[PDB]
Amino acid sequence: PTTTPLK
Numbered sequence: 001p002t003t004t005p006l007k
């Protein structure tokens with residue numbers, strides 16, 4: 001878990 005708000 002090392003993702004971020006994809007926008």
Ligand SMILES: *[C@H]1O[C@H](CO)[C@H](O)[C@H](O)[C@H]1NC(C)=O
Nearest residue numbers: 001002003004005006007
């Ligand atoms: C990052 O986003 C991804 C999208 O699938 C997952 O939700 C993941 O759990 C996220 N990581 C954190 C640290 O929130």
